């Protein structure tokens, strides 16, 4: 399996007074490992997985310093972008940043990324080659020129290709007991009778990690997308995930339908069928 380290930053300006609310979260795959919230009392990067508590107070110092640097960049950007967009001081605005690296099954660099949004829309993003930028509009074009003359992409490339992957691998090693474990989904099917002629079959997948999964229905061995409903994958709260997919079927024909489940933790896909 591939793996990824990703950080997510949100700043939300506070018109009446004070600096933006800032929240930062770090993930290794689907596992939150660190957080910073400008509203929390500690004012330090805090551990959210047990395996990151292995790191020493120098790590925590360095991560706190950096993360406050991020908060300050966003504070400035909220001001700059407000001006770029000719906006008043009355409105709250949001900046969101996400960056990180993916590695393949060999844990070698696969992909890096660094994207920025203003008020929920694309502002600027690093392109796939990590050598140039995609600016969505003319404000972002001004930012792109600044970052070009300041060779920002090159510094980011060094980090995304170098450091990011290096620490990802460290984390995968140190958190191996959970982070290198896949939890196959726990499945079952339920049945609910809508009327005298219509039944719903729901195929559940619980307790799986990572989040990536595919549930699909077939009827007599071919894919069936009509009359199906597939909920967004959702966190259980205990690090694992849940999902279900439902199909409506004519009462009595339950046996024709099969739910198929694919998941990193299942050596071959699994088929479920009602009986039960």
């Amino acid at each position: 399996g591939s793996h990824s380290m990703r950080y997510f930053f949100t700043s939300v300006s506070r018109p009446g007074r004070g600096e933006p609310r800032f929240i930062a979260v770090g993930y290794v795959d689907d596992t939150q490992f660190v957080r910073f919230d400008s509203d929390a009392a500690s004012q330090r990067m805090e551990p959210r997985a047990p395996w990151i508590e292995q790191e020493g107070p120098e790590y925590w110092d360095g991560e706190t310093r950096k993360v406050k640097a991020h908060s300050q960049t966003h504070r400035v950007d909220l001001g700059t972008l407000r001006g770029y967009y000719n906006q008043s001081e009355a409105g709250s605005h949001t900046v969101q940043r996400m960056y990180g690296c993916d590695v393949g099954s060999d844990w070698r660099f696969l992909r890096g990324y660094h994207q920025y949004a203003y008020d929920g829309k694309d502002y600027i993003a690093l392109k796939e080659d990590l050598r140039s930028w995609t600016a969505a509009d003319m404000a972002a074009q001004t930012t792109k020129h600044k970052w070009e003359a300041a060779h920002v992409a090159e510094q980011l490339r060094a980090y995304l290709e170098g450091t990011c992957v290096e620490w990802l691998r460290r984390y995968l090693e140190n958190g191996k007991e959970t982070l290198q474990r896949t939890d196959a989904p726990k499945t079952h099917m339920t049945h609910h009778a809508v009327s005298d002629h219509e039944a719903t079959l729901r195929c559940w997948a619980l307790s799986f990690y990572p989040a990536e999964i595919t549930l699909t229905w077939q009827r007599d061995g071919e894919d069936q997308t009509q009359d199906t409903e597939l909920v967004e994958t959702r966190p259980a709260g205990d690090g694992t995930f849940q999902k279900w997919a439902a199909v409506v079927v004519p009462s009595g024909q339950e046996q024709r339908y099969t739910c198929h489940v694919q998941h990193e933790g299942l050596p071959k896909p699994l088929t479920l069928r009602w009986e039960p």
Partner: peptide, 9 residues
């Protein structure tokens, strides 16, 4: 491990 320091927009 965070990147060293974002550059302002």
């Amino acid at each position: 491990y965070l990147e060293p320091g974002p550059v302002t927009a």
